[PDB]
């Protein structure tokens, strides 16, 4: 259970809820055909969009609770140690970030991180004390994105329906860069299937640890648009 709140770009903390689309509170959602799969139940909104060079080294940041209610990082802050899976971050191209709506855009996934040598993509979100990190596309083209970040908890993975999706969205202008388009974009809802092999998955070993008995961990949708 856990939320997304603040982008930082460089290691410049961008503020608390600076330019974030977020939920209400830190509940999962479970189902990959509602619109709360794009950036969450949105209740928070603002009217800014944070400058975000391309190259820039990203941040987001998950806290259990909004703000300070989230208290020190421990056992359940950013994340409950259980909660493992893929961190990943999408990107769609809009007209302005602060007033675009999010159905039926053209999202390319940017970052992804699943599982790997015994160690999942949430083991360095709680190593990192809530923060995920990826390098913005150097050759990118410049303007107005929404950026689409997704945690997908798996500890419950195994019934349908029950892999616990934490996602919310930031409004950015990528400044320089380059002129690359993605040849190939996914919608949302509509990239995840409630049974693809990532999302629909039982990932406890023959000893019941979550290593996925070994086996690799296929991270749910599109390739990665590469440089
Ligand atoms: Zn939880
Ligand atoms: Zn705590
Ligand atoms: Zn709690």
């Given at each position: 259970h856990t939320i997304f709140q603040k982008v930082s770009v460089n290691g410049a903390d961008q503020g608390q809820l600076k330019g974030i689309r977020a939920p209400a509170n830190n509940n999962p959602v479970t189902d990959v055909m509602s619109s709360d799969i794009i950036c969450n139940a949105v209740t928070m909104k603002d009217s800014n969009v944070?400058?975000?060079?391309?190259?820039?080294?990203?941040?987001?940041?998950?806290?259990?609770?909004?703000?300070?209610?989230?208290?020190?990082?421990?056992?359940?802050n950013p994340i409950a140690a259980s909660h493992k899976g893929p961190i990943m971050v999408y990107l769609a191209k809009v007209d302005n970030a602060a007033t675009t709506g999010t159905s039926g855009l053209k999202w390319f996934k940017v970052a992804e991180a699943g599982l790997s040598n015994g160690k999942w993509a949430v083991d360095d979100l709680i190593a990192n004390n809530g923060w995920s990190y990826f390098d913005m596309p150097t050759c990118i083209a410049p303007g107005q994105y929404l950026?689409?970040?997704?945690?997908?908890?798996?500890?419950?993975?195994?019934?349908?329906?029950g892999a616990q999706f934490y996602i919310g969205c930031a409004q950015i202008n990528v400044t320089g860069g380059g002129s690359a388009s993605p040849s190939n974009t996914v919608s949302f809802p509509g990239a995840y299937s409630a049974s693809d092999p990532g999302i629909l998955i039982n990932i406890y070993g023959g000893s019941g640890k979550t290593d996925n008995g070994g086996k690799p961990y296929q991270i749910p949708g599109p390739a990665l648009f590469t440089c």
């Open positions: 944070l400058t975000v060079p391309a190259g820039a080294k990203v941040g987001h940041f998950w806290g259990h609770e909004i703000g300070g209610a989230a208290g020190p990082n421990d056992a359940d950026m689409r970040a997704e945690l997908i908890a798996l500890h419950n993975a195994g019934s349908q329906a």
